[PDB]
Amino acid sequence: SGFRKMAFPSGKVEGCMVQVTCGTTTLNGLWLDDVVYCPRHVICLNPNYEDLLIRKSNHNFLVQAGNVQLRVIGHSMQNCVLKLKVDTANPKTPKYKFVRIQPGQTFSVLACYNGSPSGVYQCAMRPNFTIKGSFLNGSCGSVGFNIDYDCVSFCYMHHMELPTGVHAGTDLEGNFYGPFVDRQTAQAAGTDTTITVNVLAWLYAAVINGDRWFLNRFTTTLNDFNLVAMKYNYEPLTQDHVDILGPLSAQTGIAVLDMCASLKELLQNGMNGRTILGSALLEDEFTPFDVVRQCSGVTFQ
């Protein structure tokens, strides 16, 4: 037992991480098969990458996997991502997919500098298409991922920080999450919201781990729950979020609307100085799947 902020093992991703320099500008790339993927920002207020890209040649790109230099035999741009075709297929290429995720979904970040992995942590795509990361100068090209079965689902590539100390990036087809651009013109995320379905998933993790004080005798309708939830800046709970909470409901024998009723009381009356899984806030960066993986799914590894 126990409940931690658990990331996926990073090894399969560490084997794909390389350094990409265009002239003397350096950041991280992802080396899968023939191709290295990195932010197009490497080739540079309001730049015209289309032209900067064509004005470049394959000798303007130095890619190193540790010691070894990868010979760049072509370069192409797709959205905000650069793709460099190289002589060599990465022999440590795992099984993988490029996946575009929805707000509320979680993933692991391997933070990289100079093409070398320095750390792992768990993130959520926030409702405002931001992530709350930890990224410094040189982190761009760091990727987010889930390990779906034997298979790395890459969902995020790091591009920038906004003034609130929050972070923005693309899918691996180089399309931004949310309304952001890879240029240093004033942009802002706008107000975030709490991920209702993830908080309920985490009250279910708390019960599974024997933290039960917050449970009550009451029930609620979906509309009476949302009427309270949206006052406290929580996303409305949708029938579909009730649906995917079904398996955690059956395991615990606590009906989703009864957990809603317990959540409603917590929001109106606070914690009374008590904690839930060693937290004084309701946590919203665990999904239903995250709870089932950590609390049991993990033993079949």
How large is the greatest C-alpha to C-alpha distance in the chain, in angstroms?
A: 70
- In the residue annotation, 41 being an active-site residue is answered as yes
> Which conformational region is residue 2 in: left (phi greater than 0), alpha (psi within -120 to 50 degrees), or beta?
left
Alpha-carbon distances, residue 174 vs 77, 209, 275 (angstroms):
9, 40, 40
Q: Which does 281 bind (CB under 5 to 8 A by kind): ligand TG3, a second copy, none?
A: a second copy
Phi, psi of 7 (to 5 degrees): -90, 160
187 binds ligand TG3 (CB under 6 A): yes
Q: What is the footprint of ligand TG3 within residues 77-106 (CB under 6 A)? A: none
Q: How far is the CB of 277 from a second copy (least distance, A)?
A: 10
- In the complex with a second copy, the residue whose CB is nearer, 67 or 223, is 67
CA distance 269 to 6: 30
- Beta-ladder partners of 76: 83
166-170/152-162 β-pairing: antiparallel
Range 141-160, binding ligand TG3 (CB under 6 A):
160
**Contacting residue, 12, 75, 167, 264, with ligand TG3 by CB under 6 A:** 167
Q: Which does 14 bind (CB under 5 to 8 A by kind): a second copy, ligand TG3, none?
A: a second copy
Q: How many Cβ atoms sit within 10 Å of the Cβ of residue 232?
A: 14
Q: Which of 41, 75, 159, 167 is catalytic?
A: 41
Measured at the CA of 169, the angle between CA 297 and CA 235, to 5 degrees, comes to 60
Establish if 137 lies at the interface with ligand TG3 (CB under 6 A): yes
**Shorter beta-carbon distance to ligand TG3: residue 25 or 216:** 25
Query: Is position 140 annotated as part of the catalytic site?
Result: yes
Stretch that binds ligand TG3, among 120-128, 180-188, 216-224, 279-287 (CB under 6 A): 180-188
| Contact between 28 and 112 (Cβ < 8 Å) | yes
121 binds, among a second copy, ligand TG3, none (CB under 5 to 8 A by kind): a second copy
Which residues are at the interface with ligand TG3 (CB under 6 A)? 1, 25-27, 41, 135-140, 160-163, 167, 182-187
Task: Give catalytic residues, as residue numbers.
Answer: 41, 140
